[PDB]
Amino acid sequence: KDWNTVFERSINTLFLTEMVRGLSLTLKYFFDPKVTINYPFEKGPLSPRFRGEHALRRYPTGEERCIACKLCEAVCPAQAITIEAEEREDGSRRTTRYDIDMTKCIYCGFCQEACPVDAIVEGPNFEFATETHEELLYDKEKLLENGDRWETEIAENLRSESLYR
């Protein structure tokens, strides 16, 4: 080929002129602000639609919203919900047993979008790792405690997606 082109490409071969261009790129990122977060102190951004730990809600009067319609147990693609119901002393349709297998749960939100009374919701909590398998077998009391503990945030989120759901 041309002598000039041959000499120019031969210099790049022997002077490593395409590795210095990568070393400079790495060094530029060396002197640059980091993108890591202090997880214990600061958390990553989320959305009001986040599907986290399940919670059973209750009416502001103190009555649980669940009406034992079993419409969430039939839509659950993982069969993670088991519900037992009977007629309460007042004659109202309520659940005696409402337990969710969080080792079967796929956190898809189908139960939340199938509930006609907004009783079962997936709250914003995602930090509930346990040391025992049986602590992941949530029951009605555990779910109601979750709903009571996360009530304000769940209500605010449900207000947020009222415009969309």
Contact positions vs ligand SF4 (CB under 6 A)? 66-72, 75-78, 80-81, 83, 100, 105-111, 114-115, 117, 119-120
Q: Is 149 annotated as a binding residue?
A: no
Q: Is 24 annotated as a binding residue?
A: no
Other CB atoms within 10 Å distance of the CB of residue 81: 20
Min dist CB 84 to other proteins, Å, is: 8
Binding to other proteins by residue 113, rule CB under 8 A?
yes
Q: Is 5 annotated as a binding residue?
A: no
The answer to whether the beta carbons of residues 160 and 121 sit under 8 Å apart is no
Binding to other proteins by residue 151, rule CB under 8 A?
yes
Min dist CB 31 to other proteins, Å, is: 15
Give dist(CA 150, CA 57) in Å, integer. 9
Q: Is 72 annotated as a binding residue?
A: yes
Task: Please select the residue that binds other proteins; options are 105, 120, 142, 143, rule is CB under 8 A.
Answer: 105
Give the phi and the psi of residue 118 in degrees, each rounded to 5.
60, 45
Other CB atoms within 10 Å distance of the CB of residue 39: 8
Residue 68 binding: pick among other proteins, ligand SF4, none (C-beta 5-8 Å cut-off by kind):
ligand SF4
Buried b (16+ CB within 10 A) or exposed e, 119-148: bbbbbbbeeeeeeeeeebebebebbbebbe
Q: Which residues are annotated as a binding site for [4Fe-4S] cluster?
A: 66, 69, 72, 76, 105, 108, 111, 115
